[PDB]
RNA sequence: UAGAUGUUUAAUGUUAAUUAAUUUAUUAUUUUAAUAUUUAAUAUUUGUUUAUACAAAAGUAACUUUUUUUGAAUAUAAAGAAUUAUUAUUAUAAAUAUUAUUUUAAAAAUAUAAAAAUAAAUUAUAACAAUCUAAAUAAAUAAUAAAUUAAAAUAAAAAUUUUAAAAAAAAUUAAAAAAUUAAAAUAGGGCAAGUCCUACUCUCCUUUACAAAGAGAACGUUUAUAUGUAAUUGUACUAUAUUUAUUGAAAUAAUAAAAGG
RNA sequence: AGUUUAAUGUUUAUAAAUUGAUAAUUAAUUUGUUUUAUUUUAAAGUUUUUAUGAACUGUGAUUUAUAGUUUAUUAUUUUUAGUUUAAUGUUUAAAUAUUUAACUAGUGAUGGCACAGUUGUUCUAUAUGUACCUAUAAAAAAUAGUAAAAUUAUUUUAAU
RNA sequence: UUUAAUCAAAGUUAUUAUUAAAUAAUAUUGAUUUUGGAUGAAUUUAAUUUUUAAUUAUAUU
């Protein structure tokens, strides 16, 4: 039901294949779900990976199992032109907080007499 | 009353006729109705393993939400936030994220000691992507000479305490940020 | 993760018993400076004033009572050093030296006013003589603080919270979102229902025609 | 989950509880009727909204028969 | 594999997804039996309509009012809404013991009946001076 | 079970009181039609009908010296064999006697006359032996 | 099969069908850790079977505390 | 000495009404699960030298800080026969790396392996040579009622003989042989019944059925009916009869259980 | 650690039988505040109800020619490192290993998918279905009613 | 230095604990962390049968 490039190849050698988590606010459709119907598939990407017919395992080559939870949220779909066509900067938590130091600063700690 | 089944064949002793088989398991005797336990004993659903192959359980729990209910809005007492606000960037748990970020970018002091390195290394949390880190150096530390950020998602380090109880340090990520200028640390010497 | 041997816990439960829930003594009546005498065990009957209390352990450090030699192993700098020092003794085996009767006397936090009590309450009542006692405060650190990193008490006292130009602004950031999804919840209320009422408004038309 | 648990079938009376289901169209399986609105309504209220002439008109008995299913025995008073 | 034995046992989140109704969409019956005014070509307001309405329950919508005459296609989603959303075998404990008498059970709705407090039963039996 | 082990850690089935037997099992229907025990106590003899049983062809020309219909007591061994099934109601008690073959009115009385039955108005005083109550005439099912 | 006892530190022969063992290289006998399973306890850290757990406490109350 | 004519335990025992000498009558030969022997001075271990290709699944006893890409996210070593064991786990790619584990100073049997004779590669060969100590270290296995023996002769019991009896005079130790001791009332013929087997004419409970009735029989179902062995079963006037007709057969060549020689 | 037939009958207080039946009565004459629950231990073939199993060994269906050779022959006769057998091994390097022994020449096949126990595959061996085909897993009782084997306490007092 | 060779094992050990089992009539949407994630059908277990519902006698048939 999700963007099929997450399932099969968007290219020759399977660039998009993997599990993807999306911030609950953006309209970018992800593939990670914890429904029981979807777990025998989600677990294989953790414990086995994917064997693209091109002869290169994509989502999981070596030993440590990827953690589908802490994957940073989805931000685009891969075009054959760039690595990614970034589709929603609304996920990127660009830290837009400024700080002054001029007047009545607030040290990280506070003092008692 | 129930009247027990009877097993003393003798003068009558003709179970071959009306006698229906009462060898059928004796439900009446075990009548204590509390379920036995399954002979292949299902282990506790807690994950015991702690080594480097600690996988993440996909199965979505029940009490998990019922605690994230009461931690975004008092669940049994206060009423649910309207969904227009609940699914909005103004929903407090999401509100406290666009104006009050909470990350931990711990640079390894071991990396840039007396030596001079143009590639510092950071123990960033696992949620933070490559871009999300650059926008974190340029806005909070005003470090704006990044070239390329690599990613080595490393599992946190285990250890056993003095008793010998398995413990672990929260997972992190190693991001080899390619700087433009050789940076060091002038250790007072 | 694995458990310990049976005999292993048995040794580790007796060492650290306070790990139980609420190991402390339900009212805490032993304080530094109290006048207390031991009762039973080693040296039954000596009198000495408390100097420190280990609350979570139900024990007491008392002057000259149960004194032992705290050996101090040291590295190549200092030699093996020995130091005498009285030891934590359990409060279960000591009782108070009543400042008048100098006998056994239990001591309960008490409430209710007798003779112009400041909070209209006594703070530690002796049963035999009746002269109460106070319950002091444990000391906070006086010489703590980093002047290069500690905001002075005044920059923590500059009230900048004018709730009449931010809270009226918050309620806009919230109400915009509510007014959005609600009218956005009128898509299926319109993009689905409008089609049905057409098969009605297209029926009156084809009903008006037929009669004619 | 169920937003808005539906109300009972025939709680038209003000004092006596509604009849069991099936009788009024539902699922057979209980010989009682329980209107939570009727119980939570206190006594001084339940007697307020009625008069003696009316109380003797919903305590009304049809014991050998059903007041809702014509020709049918009172399935409040049957074996099952 | 060692982990998969003692993590696949965790009870996944359950709820009572009750039967969807494709063939009988009950939402498009607020436009049934609606008089249409001639000049305007729209459903003039029928104040009598909302009282021949059998409010059908629903999981995404509170209750959908349907004209009585088409109510019988939705007799299941009625009996599925009364039913306690749990399986019975988890709330069985309210059915076998002597709390059988203190619990509603119409349509397997394992919900509690009204119970007097312990302080009320005191006063409600002293005011009878018994 | 030692103190605590996987055989006691877990929880197999559990066992409750065993239901009893019919109180008068050992007066088996097959004897209550063959014999009748007669005589005073300490002289209980079990007489059974005497004489041959064969059903010949149409012969049997004498019906008068046919079976004399006499009760003659069974062999002394077998009386002890059956009666042995009767004593085991309360073994180890020299006090009690053998439970009789056919019921007696004190047995039919004492059975439902205990304290525990004192309020069981119906079935008291042998209601199950009397002819039934004349049922109602407006009775129906 | 199964000539001795059923414990892993038993004395006579056994079989892997009746009494299937986990392959434990060297564990402690019934009379305590001899000087062979302690060559690990001071180098490997824990007994070499991996199943036993390294209660290194009373040494910590010997040196550090 | 001691009640008696011999098989249903003795108890205020630190009064489960006590508080400093209770010195507590208490133990099941074997089926239990723990330890300890004996086999055991042992069997097996023993590390000084060979010729290098790539995947995946496979593990994760596991660490990492150090350059994955210019793709964002993700992940980069480790097995399986229980093992660090008889082993190139080879789908693919390959061709001049000395690319890094094998004790011992004796002798036999055996085990591998080896010049000469009654045109070929063979023989058999249970023939030289060659390899396999000991001690040192490490240590298992099945087995175990114990002996006071055990050399050697020699008779005695439904008996088969473990013993006992007379008569002898039989010493330690290591090594090597297996003569004796520690592993079934059996093998072969000759007969007769039985199970197995085939075969139906007559036997029993088959169900799956088919037709019949019933509905103006587009079909769905419920009763009444004898078919196949479908297929399982089993079948040696006081007298003087009766309790058995009720499936029938085949060297059914092999099995079984008996007798007989 | 280890095996279960109540060695006792004190005041309220009263317990008989008999016909095949109706019934009949010198039914002679007891006992009892009503006494009830117990019946070894271990232990075979088996049954039964649900379940699981093709990573093993069984038979499909997708591989359409990384090797040397005899005969003109594209068949071939072959090659044969793939094919029904004999010794050693004897808790053995292996809970079937190394050598010995009996024929077929991949344009039709290494698993795709599929089958499962009162029954699969079946090239029809009552062979094989994960190191004992009594398949495995779970729960249970009729299962030594069977030369079965065990059954805890000396000093005694009646016999065959 | 000589031992001719042999012959014996009897009767006590530290420093830390409060767990099991039965009993009790007053809880209860599944024990082991944050669903779906498209805004939808994943998270459905219902049907008149000794059932987690468990029965004060010895007669008659």
Tab-separated table of N, CA, C and O in Angstrom, chain C residues 75-114:
chain	number	residue	atom	x	y	z
C	75	UNK	N	48.280	3.740	48.235
C	75	UNK	CA	49.180	3.445	47.132
C	75	UNK	C	50.598	3.837	47.527
C	75	UNK	O	50.897	4.084	48.696
C	76	UNK	N	51.497	3.902	46.544
C	76	UNK	CA	52.915	4.080	46.836
C	76	UNK	C	53.222	5.383	47.566
C	76	UNK	O	54.307	5.509	48.144
C	77	UNK	N	52.303	6.349	47.560
C	77	UNK	CA	52.575	7.628	48.208
C	77	UNK	C	52.502	7.497	49.723
C	77	UNK	O	53.485	7.743	50.431
C	78	UNK	N	51.396	7.125	50.214
C	78	UNK	CA	51.281	6.994	51.651
C	78	UNK	C	51.453	5.544	52.068
C	78	UNK	O	51.114	4.631	51.316
C	79	UNK	N	51.969	5.286	53.248
C	79	UNK	CA	52.057	3.900	53.704
C	79	UNK	C	50.700	3.399	54.153
C	79	UNK	O	49.695	4.104	54.019
C	80	UNK	N	50.652	2.182	54.677
C	80	UNK	CA	49.424	1.680	55.269
C	80	UNK	C	49.071	2.540	56.472
C	80	UNK	O	49.830	2.600	57.443
C	81	UNK	N	47.933	3.218	56.410
C	81	UNK	CA	47.486	4.080	57.491
C	81	UNK	C	46.314	3.437	58.217
C	81	UNK	O	45.416	2.871	57.586
C	82	UNK	N	46.331	3.506	59.542
C	82	UNK	CA	45.217	3.055	60.364
C	82	UNK	C	44.615	4.270	61.050
C	82	UNK	O	45.335	5.198	61.434
C	83	UNK	N	43.295	4.277	61.175
C	83	UNK	CA	42.572	5.382	61.784
C	83	UNK	C	41.447	4.801	62.622
C	83	UNK	O	40.650	4.002	62.126
C	84	UNK	N	41.393	5.185	63.889
C	84	UNK	CA	40.281	4.783	64.727
C	84	UNK	C	39.066	5.650	64.428
C	84	UNK	O	39.185	6.844	64.146
C	85	UNK	N	37.890	5.034	64.488
C	85	UNK	CA	36.660	5.746	64.172
C	85	UNK	C	35.454	4.944	64.642
C	85	UNK	O	35.325	3.761	64.311
C	86	UNK	N	34.576	5.568	65.422
C	86	UNK	CA	33.348	4.904	65.835
C	86	UNK	C	32.491	4.589	64.618
C	86	UNK	O	32.631	5.199	63.557
C	87	UNK	N	31.599	3.630	64.773
C	87	UNK	CA	30.958	3.050	63.612
C	87	UNK	C	29.455	3.242	63.634
C	87	UNK	O	28.861	3.484	64.688
C	88	UNK	N	28.806	3.156	62.473
C	88	UNK	CA	27.340	3.214	62.437
C	88	UNK	C	26.731	2.065	63.221
C	88	UNK	O	27.007	0.894	62.957
C	89	UNK	N	25.906	2.409	64.202
C	89	UNK	CA	25.201	1.422	65.003
C	89	UNK	C	23.710	1.585	64.760
C	89	UNK	O	23.217	2.692	64.533
C	90	UNK	N	22.993	0.468	64.796
C	90	UNK	CA	21.575	0.480	64.468
C	90	UNK	C	20.780	1.230	65.526
C	90	UNK	O	21.061	1.135	66.722
C	91	UNK	N	19.769	1.970	65.078
C	91	UNK	CA	18.927	2.755	65.970
C	91	UNK	C	17.979	1.829	66.712
C	91	UNK	O	17.290	2.244	67.647
C	92	UNK	N	17.929	0.568	66.296
C	92	UNK	CA	17.053	-0.385	66.960
C	92	UNK	C	17.537	-0.727	68.361
C	92	UNK	O	16.777	-1.308	69.141
C	93	UNK	N	18.776	-0.375	68.699
C	93	UNK	CA	19.382	-0.751	69.967
C	93	UNK	C	19.822	0.456	70.786
C	93	UNK	O	20.641	0.312	71.697
C	94	UNK	N	19.315	1.644	70.474
C	94	UNK	CA	19.620	2.836	71.252
C	94	UNK	C	18.321	3.532	71.615
C	94	UNK	O	17.318	3.436	70.901
C	95	UNK	N	18.341	4.226	72.749
C	95	UNK	CA	17.222	5.038	73.192
C	95	UNK	C	17.772	6.348	73.729
C	95	UNK	O	18.981	6.511	73.905
C	96	UNK	N	16.870	7.285	73.994
C	96	UNK	CA	17.248	8.672	74.230
C	96	UNK	C	17.490	8.955	75.704
C	96	UNK	O	16.822	8.399	76.581
C	97	UNK	N	18.458	9.830	75.965
C	97	UNK	CA	18.722	10.329	77.309
C	97	UNK	C	17.823	11.538	77.535
C	97	UNK	O	18.122	12.638	77.068
C	98	UNK	N	16.719	11.331	78.237
C	98	UNK	CA	15.779	12.403	78.530
C	98	UNK	C	16.480	13.512	79.308
C	98	UNK	O	17.042	13.242	80.379
C	99	UNK	N	16.475	14.755	78.819
C	99	UNK	CA	17.230	15.822	79.499
C	99	UNK	C	16.819	16.067	80.942
C	99	UNK	O	17.479	16.861	81.621
C	100	UNK	N	15.756	15.431	81.434
C	100	UNK	CA	15.378	15.541	82.838
C	100	UNK	C	15.471	14.205	83.562
C	100	UNK	O	16.184	14.099	84.563
C	101	UNK	N	14.781	13.173	83.075
C	101	UNK	CA	14.726	11.896	83.773
C	101	UNK	C	15.919	11.002	83.477
C	101	UNK	O	16.195	10.090	84.262
C	102	UNK	N	16.619	11.234	82.367
C	102	UNK	CA	17.794	10.441	82.007
C	102	UNK	C	17.495	8.946	82.048
C	102	UNK	O	18.291	8.154	82.554
C	103	UNK	N	16.334	8.554	81.532
C	103	UNK	CA	15.925	7.160	81.452
C	103	UNK	C	15.427	6.846	80.042
C	103	UNK	O	15.626	7.622	79.101
C	104	UNK	N	14.801	5.683	79.891
C	104	UNK	CA	14.181	5.330	78.623
C	104	UNK	C	13.020	6.270	78.334
C	104	UNK	O	12.248	6.618	79.229
C	105	UNK	N	12.902	6.689	77.077
C	105	UNK	CA	11.845	7.620	76.686
C	105	UNK	C	11.678	7.570	75.178
C	105	UNK	O	12.600	7.931	74.442
C	106	UNK	N	10.512	7.128	74.719
C	106	UNK	CA	10.202	7.171	73.302
C	106	UNK	C	9.854	8.603	72.903
C	106	UNK	O	9.709	9.488	73.748
C	107	UNK	N	9.910	8.882	71.612
C	107	UNK	CA	9.860	10.295	71.177
C	107	UNK	C	9.026	10.371	69.902
C	107	UNK	O	9.504	9.901	68.862
C	108	UNK	N	7.829	10.950	69.983
C	108	UNK	CA	6.925	10.925	68.812
C	108	UNK	C	6.709	12.328	68.282
C	108	UNK	O	6.558	13.244	69.094
C	109	UNK	N	6.719	12.476	66.961
C	109	UNK	CA	6.380	13.805	66.389
C	109	UNK	C	4.959	14.033	66.866
C	109	UNK	O	4.141	13.109	66.731
C	110	UNK	N	4.669	15.213	67.388
C	110	UNK	CA	3.309	15.374	67.967
C	110	UNK	C	2.669	16.609	67.353
C	110	UNK	O	3.398	17.422	66.816
C	111	UNK	N	1.342	16.676	67.373
C	111	UNK	CA	0.616	17.822	66.776
C	111	UNK	C	-0.318	18.387	67.846
C	111	UNK	O	-0.495	17.694	68.863
C	112	UNK	N	-0.819	19.607	67.655
C	112	UNK	CA	-1.677	20.292	68.668
C	112	UNK	C	-0.794	21.173	69.548
C	112	UNK	O	0.386	20.841	69.772
C	113	UNK	N	-1.375	22.295	69.948
C	113	UNK	CA	-0.761	23.445	70.605
C	113	UNK	C	-0.953	23.334	72.111
C	113	UNK	O	-2.033	22.958	72.570
C	114	UNK	N	0.092	23.642	72.880
C	114	UNK	CA	-0.039	23.672	74.333
C	114	UNK	C	0.218	25.049	74.929
C	114	UNK	O	-0.681	25.617	75.556
